[PDB]
Amino acid sequence: MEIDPKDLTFLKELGTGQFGVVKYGKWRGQYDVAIKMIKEGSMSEDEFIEEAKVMMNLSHEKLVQLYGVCTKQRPIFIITEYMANGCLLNYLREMRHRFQTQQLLEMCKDVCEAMEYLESKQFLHRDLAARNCLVNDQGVVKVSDFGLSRYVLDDEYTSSVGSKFPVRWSPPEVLMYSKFSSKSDIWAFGVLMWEIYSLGKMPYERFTNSETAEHIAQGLRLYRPHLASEKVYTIMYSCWHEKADERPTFKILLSNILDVMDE
Numbered sequence: 202m203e204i205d206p207k208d209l210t211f212l213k214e215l216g217t218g219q220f221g222v223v224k225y226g227k228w229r230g231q232y233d234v235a236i237k238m239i240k241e242g243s244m245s246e247d248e249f250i251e252e253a254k255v256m257m258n259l260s261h262e263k264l265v266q267l268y269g270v271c272t273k274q275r276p277i278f279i280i281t282e283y284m285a286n287g288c289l290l291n292y293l294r295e296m297r298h299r300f301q302t303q304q305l306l307e308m309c310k311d312v313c314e315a316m317e318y319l320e321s322k323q324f325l326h327r328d329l330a331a332r333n334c335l336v337n338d339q340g341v342v343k344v345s346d347f348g349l350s351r352y353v354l355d356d357e358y359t360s361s362v363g364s365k366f367p368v369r370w371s372p373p374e375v376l377m378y379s380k381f382s383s384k385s386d387i388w389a390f391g392v393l394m395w396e397i398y399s400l401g402k403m404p405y406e407r408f409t410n411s412e413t414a415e416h417i418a419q420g421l422r423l424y425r426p427h428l429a430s431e432k433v434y435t436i437m438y439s440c441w442h443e444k445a446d447e448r449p450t451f452k453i454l455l456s457n458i459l460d461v462m463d464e
C-alpha cells in the first residue's frame with residue numbers, strides 16, 4: 202500500500218481535485234500515474250489511511266485503480282491509474298468530438314459496470330457525477346474518487362446545506378436526512394446519465410441548490426434530453442423514484458442498458 206517517494210517522478214500538473222493539485226508522473230521508472238496531493242488540513246488522514254487498505258482491494262476495469270499512498274511525509278499523496286483524456290464532463294463538452302447516441306449509451310454502460318462492482322462489495326461512492334469520472338486513451342469511462350467525500354474536512358462540502366455540497370446529484374433522503382445507501386448512488390447515476398445525454402449540461406440550470414432541493418420535493422425531475430430515446434429516459438428516470446426502495450439496483454440497470462443497446 203505504501204509507495205516510497207524515491208520510486209516516483211513528479212511532472213506536469215493535470216489540474217485541481219477536492220484535496221488539492223493532481224500531477225502526472227511515473228512510478229518505478231515505468232508506469233504512468235496520477236499523483237493526488239492532499240493539502241495538509243483538507244482531509245481526516247487517520248480515517249482515510251485505514252480505509253485505503255479496503256480501497257486497495259477494489260479492482261475493476263471500469264474503476265480508476267488505486268496503486269498506493271505516500272504517508273511517511275506531509276502533504277500525503279494518493280497514487281492512481283493515469284486517465285489520458287481526463288475529466289468526463291470536459292470530454293462531453295469538447296466540441297471537437299461528435300458523439301453517436303450508441304457511444305453515449307456505452308459511456309453509461311461503463312459507469313454502470315463499475316457501480317455494480319462497488320455495490321457488490323457494499324462500497325458507496327457518495328459523490329458520483331461526470332466531474333468525478335475519467336476517460337482513458339481508448340475513450341473508456343471509469344469511476345474515480347469513490348468513497349473519498351467521507352474524509353473531506355470542509356463543512357461547505359460535507360453539510361447538505363453547504364454551498365459546495367452535491368445537491369443536484371442527491372436524492373430527497375440525502376438532502377433532508379443525510380441517508381446514504383446504494384440507492385443514493387443509484388439516484389446520482391441517473392443524474393450522471395442525464396449529464397451524458399445532455400452532453401455535459403449542468404443539471405437544473407437556472408435553479409440554485411435550495412431551489413433544486415425544492416423542485417425535487419415537489420416531485421419534479423430532469424427533463425428528457427433529446428438524444429435520449431423513451432427507453433433510455435425510462436432507465437435514468439427509474440433512478441429518481443421518491444421511495445429509495447422502488448429504485449433499481451446496478452445489476453437491474455446494467456441488464457436494462459444491455460437490453461436497449463441490443464434493440
Ligand SMILES: CC(C)(C)c1ccc(C(=O)N[C@@H]2CCCN(c3ccc(C(N)=O)c(Nc4ccc(C(=O)N5CCOCC5)cc4)n3)C2)cc1
Pocket residue numbers: 215216217218223234235265281282283284285286287288291332335
Ligand atoms: C483546460 C482544459 C484543457 C480544457 C482541461 C480539461 C480537462 C482537465 C481535467 O481533466 N482536469 C482534472 C479534473 C479532476 C482532477 N484531475 C485529474 C484527476 C485524475 C486524473 C487521472 N487519474 O489521470 C486526471 N487526468 C488527466 C487530466 C487532464 C488531462 C489533460 O491533459 N487534458 C484533458 C483532455 O484535454 C486535453 C488536456 C489528462 C489526464 N486528472 C484533473 C483539465 C484541463
